[PDB]
Design an enzyme around this catalytic site. Structure first.
Site, short mmCIF file in Angstrom:
data_model
loop_
_atom_site.label_atom_id
_atom_site.label_comp_id
_atom_site.label_asym_id
_atom_site.label_seq_id
_atom_site.Cartn_x
_atom_site.Cartn_y
_atom_site.Cartn_z
N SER A 62 0.79 -1.23 0.00
CA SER A 62 0.00 0.00 0.00
C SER A 62 0.82 1.28 0.00
CB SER A 62 -0.94 0.02 1.20
OG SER A 62 -2.09 -0.74 0.92
N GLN A 118 -10.70 -5.17 -0.82
CA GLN A 118 -10.10 -5.81 -1.98
C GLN A 118 -11.12 -5.90 -3.11
OE1 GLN A 118 -7.04 -6.27 -1.95
NE2 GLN A 118 -6.47 -6.56 0.20
N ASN A 150 -8.65 -0.82 -1.52
CA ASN A 150 -7.96 -0.86 -2.81
C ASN A 150 -8.92 -0.63 -3.97
OD1 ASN A 150 -5.56 -1.45 -1.49
ND2 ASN A 150 -5.78 -3.67 -1.77
N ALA A 316 1.66 -3.33 2.95
CA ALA A 316 2.04 -4.73 3.07
C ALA A 316 1.57 -5.49 1.85
CB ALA A 316 1.47 -5.36 4.34
#
Ligand SMILES: [Cl-]
Ligand SMILES: [Cl-]
Ligand code: NI
Ligand code: NI
Ligand code: NI
Ligand code: NI
Ligand code: NI
Length: 359
Positions: A62, A118, A150, A316
């Site tokens: 990220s 996600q 995201n 991460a």
């Protein structure tokens, strides 16, 4: 006395962290009075005993979103987009009613109303993506709740480059990476560079990030400790380059668009007023908080970048964990890259200990 002082606090802070978290390889850069100091530990590849070096590539996860934010800021400064523009202006086939009132600002800042963390793994093509967003039902009105996602900033990145006529990767290379001389920073690692691409480690298994929709925009950048130090330097105030839309776009990514608690949402970057309560950023970095919905208050007009700020981003992947933080008022910053995804508060607490000793 400064280099000796930096070496000591870095050694006394990172060495116990590596041992406690069982980190296989790590690179750290301290930006002190604008100058970078580099440190490496351990292995990029455990099986082959290949050490981490200043040319080792790590997955940023990220932290990639800070590049996306800056590329979006550059597009604003070029006049190609406005954050108040409807998302549908750049994707006219996105006709579903729930998108009425959702802007590029909401996508960029995770405030569209509950876009998920996600993109679902079954979504692969552009047409899959359209059906996903066409069928998505918001939990909240736009601009009321922040929910890290995201699927939100990833779509912002994909839409923001449409006026350029370039692919997302071409836009990032030509408008951000090349002008800032980040020549060891990649969305797709080229074959000759793989010898320096670290393995990530997850439950003792060597892994690289999996391909996924909007990966480049949300979590797909890989970089070295030297290029990430140059990234910090580029986001510090004294930047003065020929590419003025990029210089301005960098400043816009540190504008304060929303407040929640004691943190402010920028484009990719997150900010707090400095001096900062270290427990607030350490505790607030735990995903039980950082991934939860939080009410936001709009800041209109957005606050221009505040020099007395703690500016930072965790990132991460399955096998990597990263952290970047800097204080523009002090020309001070840190980059921590590791090929294990270990908990965010451990990263932030170590960064607080190092920067507090050097500020
Ligand atoms: Cl704007
Ligand atoms: Cl966490
Ligand atoms: Ni090279
Ligand atoms: Ni001081
Ligand atoms: Ni000072
Ligand atoms: Ni001082
Ligand atoms: Ni002082």
């Amino acid at each position: 006395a400064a280099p000796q002082q930096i070496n000591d606090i870095v050694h006394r802070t990172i060495t116990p962290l590596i041992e406690q978290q069982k980190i296989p390889g790590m690179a750290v850069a301290v930006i002190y009075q604008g100058k970078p100091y580099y440190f490496t530990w351990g292995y990029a590849d455990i099986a082959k005993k290949q050490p981490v070096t200043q040319q080792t590539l790590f997955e940023l996860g990220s932290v990639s979103k800070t590049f996306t934010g800056v590329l979006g800021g550059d597009a604003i400064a070029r006049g190609e987009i406005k954050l108040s523009d409807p998302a549908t202006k750049y994707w006219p086939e996105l006709t579903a009613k729930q998108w009425n009132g959702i802007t590029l600002l909401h996508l960029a800042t995770y405030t569209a109303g509950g876009l998920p963390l996600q993109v679902p793994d079954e979504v692969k093509s552009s047409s899959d993506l359209l059906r996903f967003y066409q069928n998505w039902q918001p939990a909240w009105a736009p601009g009321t709740q922040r929910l890290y996602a995201n699927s939100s900033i990833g779509l912002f990145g994909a839409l923001a480059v449409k006026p350029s006529g370039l692919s997302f990767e071409q836009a990032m290379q030509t408008r951000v990476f090349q002008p800032l001389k980040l020549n060891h920073t990649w969305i797709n690692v080229p074959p000759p560079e793989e010898k320096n691409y670290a393995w990530g480690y997850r439950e003792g298994k060597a892994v690289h990030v999996s391909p996924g929709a909007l990966d480049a925009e949300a979590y797909g950048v890989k970089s070295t400790i030297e290029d990430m130090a140059r990234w910090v330097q580029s986001n510090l105030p004294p930047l003065d380059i020929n590419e003025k839309t990029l210089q301005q776009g960098i400043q816009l990514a540190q504008s304060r668009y929303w407040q929640t608690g004691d943190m402010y949402q920028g484009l990719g970057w997150e900010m707090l007023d400095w001096p900062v309560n270290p427990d607030s950023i350490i505790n607030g970095s735990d995903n039980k908080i950082a991934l939860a919905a939080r009410p936001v208050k709009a800041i209109k007009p957005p606050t221009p970048a505040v020099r007395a700020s703690w500016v930072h981003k965790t990132g991460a992947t399955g096998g990597f964990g990263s952290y970047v933080a800097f204080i523009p008022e002090k020309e001070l910053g840190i980059v921590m890259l590791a090929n294990k995804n270990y908990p965010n508060p451990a990263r932030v607490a170590a960064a607080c200990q190092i920067l507090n000793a050097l500020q």
